[PDB]
Amino acid sequence: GSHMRGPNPTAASLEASAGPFTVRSFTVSRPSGYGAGTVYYPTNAGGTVGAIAIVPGYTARQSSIKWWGPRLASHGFVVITIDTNSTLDQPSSRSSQQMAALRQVASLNGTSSSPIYGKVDTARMGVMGWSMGGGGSLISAANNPSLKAAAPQAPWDSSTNFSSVTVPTLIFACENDSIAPVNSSALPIYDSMSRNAKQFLEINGGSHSCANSGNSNQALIGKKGVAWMKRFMDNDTRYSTFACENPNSTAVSDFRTANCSLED
């Protein structure tokens, strides 16, 4: 049940700005169930790839999360970054919209005129997002346990009980977050998940925007995002160490992981 794409990874290849694949992108013409989207895809992945939908936070737009599009897509994923129907949509709505974005990627996969016709394995999907869009990604995972992976950043949700989530979940947290403080948001959410493979990666001295476009830790955060998606969406055990390891980075102020084997 593995779906391996690309060459055997190294720390260097995963820390680099781009993976091996050429990336192209397009705006979605008639978004269905969300405000706007950009689709990033590899032109040449050598097989179908999984799809990942990424949602910004309250007031925010695609620009905040855009860096993930090329970063992931270059490693062999189809990535859709969205704007929400309103910038003031709440976590539940962001989750519906995220899923709508995945549905619409599946639609384009079956549309002969689309640049992503036949490129997507619609059975292998993941979710990411910032703040309320991170809470939305956790809600998506709770409500859709067939998702293969979740990797929210600086998550915000008025509930921290995600105990039903069985989807492999990487929580990026920002140490000095004053919007969704770690000790009331990201850590309780992480500790609530008792049934899954999971990880907690807190970025040293990070503000609430520490994993957004233009951040100073794209080597480390990009490595870990891509590794987690590869291990869990692709069942690619070449990535078990990169996904599950303490990355031994001075950029990391707190590292925790459970049910995450280093074994390949």
Residue numbers in the entry: 30 to 293
Copy the relevant paper text:
At the active site of IsPETase, three residues Ser160, His237, and Asp206 form a catalytic triad and Ser160 is postulated to function as a covalent nucleophile to the carbonyl carbon atom in the scissile ester bond, as in other carboxylesterases.
Arg280 at the end of subsite IIc is a polar residue and shows protruding shape, which seems to hinder stable binding of PET substrate beyond the fourth moiety. Based on these results, we predicted that the substitution of Arg280 into a small hydrophobic residue might allow more stable binding of longer substrate, subsequently leading to an increase in PETase activity. We replaced Arg280 with Ala, and measured both the BHET hydrolytic and the PETase activities. As hypothesized, IsPETaseR280A showed increased PETase activity by 22.4% in 18 h and 32.4% in 36 h, compared with IsPETaseW/T, when PET film was used as a substrate. As expected, compared with IsPETaseW/T, IsPETaseR280A showed an extended subsite IIc by providing hydrophobic and non-protruding cleft. Then, the crystal structure of this variant (Arg280Ala) was solved as well, which showed that the structure was altered to better accommodate PET substrate as we hypothesized. This is an important finding as the structure-based engineering of a residue (Arg280), which is located far away from the catalytic site with a distance of ~ 23 Å could be selected for enhancing the PETase activity.
